[PDB]
Design a binder for this molecule. Structure first.
Ligand SMILES: [Zn+2]
Ligand SMILES: [Zn+2]
Ligand SMILES: [Zn+2]
Ligand SMILES: [Zn+2]
Lengths: 101, 99
DNA sequence: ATTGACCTCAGCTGAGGTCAAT
DNA sequence: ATTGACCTCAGCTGAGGTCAAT
C-alpha cells in the first residue's frame, strides 16, 4: 500500500520491502554504483524522509532504506548483472535462430 | 511443512492451503467432477484423516479439506478449463514447427 | 475408477534497464 | 548526474494433466 521508506504509493516488494518505484530505483542505483559511502547529511543524520523530502538528503534516505530492511544482497553485482544481460541476449538469440530451422 | 488435511509432507500452497499432492489432487478431482455430494461416511462423520487413513473415508477427507479452508473457486470450471487447454495447444504447435 | 508423484505451462513477481525531466 | 514512471523478461508459483499402480 504505502512505501515503508517515504510513504507514497508502493508498487509491491522490492529488495524485501514494500516500496515506491522511487525508493526502489534509489536503493538499486546506490548499491549498483556504490554511492552510499559518499553520501553525507548536511545536518543531524535524522532528516525526515517522506515523499516530499526524500530528495532532500541522500544519506538519510539510504539509511532509512537499510533500517526498514532492504536487502543489499538482492542487488546483482556487475558480473551477474552482465550475465543476465547476456542470458537475455542468448535467449533472444536461441529464440531468434531456433525459429528458422 | 506439513499438510493441514492429513499431516504428511506438504508441497506448498494449493487452493489457498498448505497441502500434499494427494490432498491437492483429491480436492481437485472432487471439484472438477463434482463428486462430493456422492461421498458417504460409513461411520460417524468423524473419521481420523492422517496420512495412513486418508483413503479410508472420502467424505471425511473432503470435509476436512473444506474445514481447513481449501478454495473451491480456485478450481477451474469446464468453461475456462478447456479454454486453458485450447490456449496451450496453439502454443505447442507454433513452437513445434520451429525448429 | 481412483490415487498421488511427477510433469507442463500461463501469468506473476520482482529483478534490471530506459530516458524525459530535473 | 540523478530521479522515477514505465518498460522487458527469467523464473517462480500454483493451476491442470499424465499414468503406473491399485
Ligand atoms: Zn518511497
Ligand atoms: Zn540528513
Ligand atoms: Zn494431505
Ligand atoms: Zn468418515
Amino acid at each position: 500500500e504505502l512505501c515503508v521508506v517515504c510513504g507514497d504509493k508502493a508498487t509491491g516488494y522490492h529488495y524485501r520491502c514494500i516500496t515506491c518505484e522511487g525508493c526502489k530505483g534509489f536503493f538499486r542505483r546506490t548499491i549498483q554504483k556504490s554511492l552510499h559511502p559518499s553520501y553525507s547529511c548536511k545536518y543531524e543524520g535524522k532528516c525526515i524522509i517522506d515523499k516530499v523530502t526524500r530528495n532532500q538528503c541522500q544519506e538519510c534516505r539510504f539509511k532509512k532504506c537499510i533500517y526498514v530492511g532492504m536487502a543489499t544482497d538482492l542487488v546483482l553485482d556487475d558480473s551477474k548483472r552482465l550475465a543476465k544481460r547476456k542470458l537475455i541476449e542468448e535467449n533472444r538469440e536461441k529464440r531468434r535462430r531456433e525459429e528458422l530451422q
